[PDB]
Design a protein around this ligand. Structure first.
Ligand SMILES: NC(=O)c1ccc[n+]([C@@H]2O[C@H](COP(=O)([O-])OP(=O)(O)OC[C@H]3O[C@@H](n4cnc5c(N)ncnc54)[C@H](O)[C@@H]3O)[C@@H](O)[C@H]2O)c1
Ligand SMILES: NC(=O)c1ccc[n+]([C@@H]2O[C@H](COP(=O)([O-])OP(=O)(O)OC[C@H]3O[C@@H](n4cnc5c(N)ncnc54)[C@H](O)[C@@H]3O)[C@@H](O)[C@H]2O)c1
Ligand SMILES: NC(=O)c1ccc[n+]([C@@H]2O[C@H](COP(=O)([O-])OP(=O)(O)OC[C@H]3O[C@@H](n4cnc5c(N)ncnc54)[C@H](O)[C@@H]3O)[C@@H](O)[C@H]2O)c1
Ligand SMILES: NC(=O)c1ccc[n+]([C@@H]2O[C@H](COP(=O)([O-])OP(=O)(O)OC[C@H]3O[C@@H](n4cnc5c(N)ncnc54)[C@H](O)[C@@H]3O)[C@@H](O)[C@H]2O)c1
Ligand SMILES: NCCc1ccc(S(=O)(=O)F)cc1
Ligand SMILES: NCCc1ccc(S(=O)(=O)F)cc1
Ligand SMILES: NCCc1ccc(S(=O)(=O)F)cc1
Lengths: 333, 333, 333, 333
């Protein structure tokens, strides 16, 4: 399984990183035009949140070197001009943040790539998949797909398990989200005039933000269509975010029973995707945690037999980056 | 109205500051045994969040000097030993955090103080009052009372207005809360071994926390008893906190109607307590805002006609501090 | 004195705000093409550091409205086209960061501006001035000038006084610097690929940075040319930076005497530019302090009678912005 | 070597951790009365900076269990009451911060411990030892020693190398120091009324601080007595600090040569203690680096052939904790 990476940013680089540890998938090419090979290597060797790269990194003959493996590096603004074909790339991890329609992402297909995974929710009707939730509903005919957002990957397993046993009538979600590259260090104009709040100083603000993440749950779980939505607060934190789902349940239950059901899934049919802790955890405890969702039993509570607050952690960078690789293997195999 | 301050902390010093800009109330006496007079002045003079004290601040003969006015300074650990009576104190602002029961707080009365306000939720059944909400129900025969928490002061006005018109069936609250003095700069043991998470690094964590702030709305508004509770996440922010109320209503509404109902309350009955904004605000926009609650119209949303997320901001330090003075004025006059 | 502003960023907007107060200078025109008018009002009305604009900000018919005062707003990329002459502009504040040569800035003269001040050090041999130091050496024939950097404005007053009285033989400088717009919220590529370190996450890092600011003190004080240089460390701080000057003196001295000579200057001829304190201050105490440099007596020390560490604070945004105005007024009168 | 730990804080817990990977040293007993067993397991297991403990941490029958190995846990305020003798403790890591005196530390010897290491500079005459610089001078008859400060362990190796080769005429230091447990989350009164600035908000401030770490280098390298001193600035950073030495040299040198000397020291006699890099590094890159000092070639510079600014990083927590073990093993074998 040969992977290509378009946009060697936080997601691009950590996807590269997770892929090094996996035997079944291999990175063969990278593209980023805001980055010379000298600069690119620097940014990969050092990382402020996840530590240094697990082995030596040099460049040679326009390639990137990780032991006995060469990796092509390109610097093209236009995806139609990236030579994926010559590297026999099976899947392109589209992680720039600006090619989020079927039309724009199909430019990768023109360059010789077989299939594409947007590392974000699409702006159009592109099919969305969450590993562990609806990934088996994929078929090889779909060449361009989305792996949703980190928040959707955190929310979907939690909702699926609660909905199958108890039945979610309606739910509203809040995610307290770690910092992202779309934000600014000092009050300034946000990109293209959209989302003014995200241009406000990241270091000292709680910043309200819209998200479709919870509304997207209805795409990967049709049954919950129109039954979920939410908002986000961005806060000055390196990585790790948390979802807080307030939902009303059809079948009544104590909080103890809800927790045990989530424990059952995390230990059985959702091992590796959904996790369960009863510890007094805080955000830094999930730095570099590869799961999509870790239910925090003690943070949440119940108002009554039918109204619950359910709390789940996620490393927005690491968890998600591992899911891109899982999906990339799945669609190719 | 002659005020005394026990515990010259974040609340004590900002209570002193607010009272400096009011003619109807003045601080005559201060007690803090963990603070010598030179130290006290220094801490009053400078402030990391709210700037330098708007005044020449000095001391002489054991008195604090704010312009042409002398303030009495004490340093007893036992409140019983503070000569409040000789300073002719009408109300004592109990802002130490360690005298939150009617038995402990009554020693101020034994020191001569006529009345006491607990600047926090009580640990017993001491009466709780929130300006704008139930302060007219105060009986002068009550010598010791509590002004609740900053979070309750934010949530109750919001909940009141919404419940008066639409009726709240149930509700769960999250507050994303700024930093407080019970937290630690690096990972350590929390005082008494209680609330382990709050001992974790304040600078780099999202920290789950319990709170009775929502349950206690039921005390100030009996009609909502058993219908509200919540949780909190602490974040590395200087001041300003935000409440997210997910509530289910009986009378259906569009989001715009709910917003309008809050607007008219804010410009009418609850003017000065509850505020309204449709601007793209972030937390630092409410530093030194003296309102108890500021509804953020564009940050909230509705899922359907009976299920809402309503967002409100508060300067947990400065808002609450002015509330302590309005309650001090009320229970005296 | 009619001022125009090119680039409405941190320095652009803060010059604007500084000017609003003063009765001897006024902003008549603004230009910034990465900013729609509605968005410009938003950035002007709210500030994460210096609080809400002390006045109603609106717009109508393409004009910025401050109360009832109309300010003209353009969105041009070629300063030649900005109609400065139409607005009778005496000085243009060049605060984009990308017109720092004589060739580039002189497009403002062809647009009708009478003179230009660069809000940064120049790339070429454009004359540099610092108020209090060498501003009297400016002659009216010079149409394009520079106000240097915030750091140079901090150091040069301190440098002049120490060298005037004692004689600086050599010296080296570290500034610990607040965060600036050239930095990123998460690890990424810095612009143009210059200074890889500045692209590293700003929230969690101490980031070494080059600075010519200390070498630039030679150009404003020829006598010290070759005898000073230094480096910088960027830290997660909103505003306020500190200079730390290690230096050797020709004539020997005690720390007290050095300190008293700075006190004499700060309360005498350099009043308003160089300040002095013996208080136990921290960076937040100089937020919105309009002086160029404030010497911190207790923070510095001597090793011997010829070798000293001298410490001085500066709000790198506010002090500098006010300096820009002083220069503008000076060069016009 | 059987190690005991009094004070299970940042240094205590990370000393425990480093030992877990060392065969030449083992922890048999811990004392910390501010933290019961359930709480102590939590703090060991989770770490906000260095990640989770790399092992299952549990407890039974009053013992801390790291796998099969049982560790005794006392809760004793009076260090003379700890029964170190019953556990055959060779060395006590005295890392509480409140027993920095021969007389006070010697109460560990009454408990049965053979020897004691102060994890900090002493308040009295106690012998200081930096590994790699002066440790070989230790005599087995000295039962109580100090391992100096993180800052001194960073500057000493550098100063040694520079002085041996070029001759340090005089020097002044500045350290930018990561956050420490003596600071406060919000403006407050520091312990004992000492160091007022350390009580100011850790999250939002650059905070000046005194330090004898530079002067103490003259104690471990007598040739440098009276030639070094300096100051510190605290910044909102989890761990990793930097030293900035401005020094005059007796023999003139090109900066390239000064770097080359440090390189061969780091690859030869000071391998493991003193490090060297030419990479564009930032503070986060040295998290969990076990060296005491990492020279940063590109950060520093020279003013002339005699006057240099030399820059070096250190993980104040992890580097130091590793040196405590080295000293413990050395004073026992
Ligand atoms: N970081 C997260 O928490 C997170 C989680 C899940 C999904 N995502 C999504 O992944 C995407 C990338 O996010 P990120 O956080 O890595 O942002 P980022 O800014 O760190 O990375 C984007 C990278 O793409 C590069 N790029 C820009 N234009 C390009 C072009 N024309 N061609 C090729 N490369 C280009 C940039 O130089 C940059 O390195 C976004 O859509 C984001 O929403 C982010
Ligand atoms: N800061 C907020 O966001 C906020 C908002 C609302 C309510 N409160 C409440 O107000 C109370 C104080 O909060 P704070 O943040 O100001 O805490 P703080 O640490 O800033 O202040 C507590 C002060 O009490 C003093 N003190 C301790 N023991 C004392 C005693 N024995 N006698 C006299 N003084 C003593 C301390 O010296 C300290 O200055 C708490 O109960 C808190 O819940 C805080
Ligand atoms: N903030 C400080 O501490 C400080 C202090 C001293 C000097 N400076 C200098 O002042 C300059 C500006 O810095 P800043 O901090 O305001 O950064 P900033 O990003 O806040 O300001 C730049 C602004 O200029 C605008 N702009 C960019 N290109 C433009 C163009 N070609 N035409 C018109 N407008 C354009 C942008 O919209 C932006 O708002 C820099 O050169 C900086 O070195 C900054
Ligand atoms: N943290 C650093 O960057 C660093 C680096 C070098 C040296 N040091 C030194 O190490 C010492 C400890 O620092 P820290 O950062 O670990 O502080 P810390 O606050 O994290 O740890 C101190 C521990 O001692 C415990 N304690 C208090 N009184 C006690 C008593 N009577 N008996 C037993 N335990 C008691 C506390 O509960 C706490 O857990 C300080 O003197 C400091 O100067 C710290
Ligand atoms: N360079 C900006 C790319 C980008 C755009 C959006 C995000 S998001 O995760 O906030 F949606 C992250 C990064
Ligand atoms: N001195 C610490 C006392 C204290 C105790 C509690 C708080 S709280 O507002 O977080 F509940 C704040 C301060
Ligand atoms: N309990 C606080 C103990 C302590 C005391 C001092 C420090 S210091 O490293 O700043 F000198 C660190 C920790």
């Amino acid at each position: 399984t040969k992977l290509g990476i378009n946009g060697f940013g936080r997601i691009g680089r950590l996807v590269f990183r997770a892929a090094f540890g996996r035997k079944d998938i291999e990175v063969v090419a990278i593209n980023d035009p805001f980055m010379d090979l000298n600069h690119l290597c620097y940014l990969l060797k050092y990382d402020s949140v996840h530590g240094q790269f697990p082995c030596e990194v040099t460049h040679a003959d326009g390639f990137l070197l990780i032991g006995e493996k060469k990796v092509s590096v390109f610097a093209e603004k236009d995806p139609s001009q990236i030579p994926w074909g010559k590297c026999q790339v099976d899947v392109v991890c589209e992680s720039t943040g600006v090619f989020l329609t079927k039309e724009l992402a199909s430019s990768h297909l023109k360059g010789g790539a077989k299939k594409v995974i947007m590392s974000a929710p699409p702006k159009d009707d592109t099919p969305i998949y969450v590993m562990g939730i609806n990934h088996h509903q994929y078929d090889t005919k779909q060449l361009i797909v989305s792996n949703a957002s980190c928040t959707t990957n955190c929310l979907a397993p939690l909702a699926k398990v609660i909905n199958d046993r108890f039945g979610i009538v309606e739910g509203l979600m809040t995610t307290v989200h770690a910092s992202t590259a779309n934000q600014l260090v000092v009050d300034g104009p946000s990109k293209g005039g959209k989302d003014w709040r995200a241009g406000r100083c990241a270091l000292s603000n709680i910043i309200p933000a819209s998200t479709g993440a919870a509304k997207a749950v209805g795409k990967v779980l049709p049954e919950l269509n129109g039954k979920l939505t939410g908002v986000a607060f961005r806060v000055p934190i390196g990585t790790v975010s948390v979802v807080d789902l307030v939902c009303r349940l059809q079948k009544p239950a104590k909080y103890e029973e809800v927790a045990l059901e989530i424990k059952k899934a995390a230990e059985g049919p959702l091992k590796g995707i959904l996790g369960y802790t009863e510890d007094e955890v805080v955000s830094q405890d999930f730095v570099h945690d590869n799961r999509s969702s870790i239910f925090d039993m003690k943070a949440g509570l119940a108002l009554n037999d039918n109204f619950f607050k359910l709390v789940s952690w996620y490393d927005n960078e690491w968890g998600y980056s591992n899911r891109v690789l899982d999906l990339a293997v799945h669609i190719t195999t």
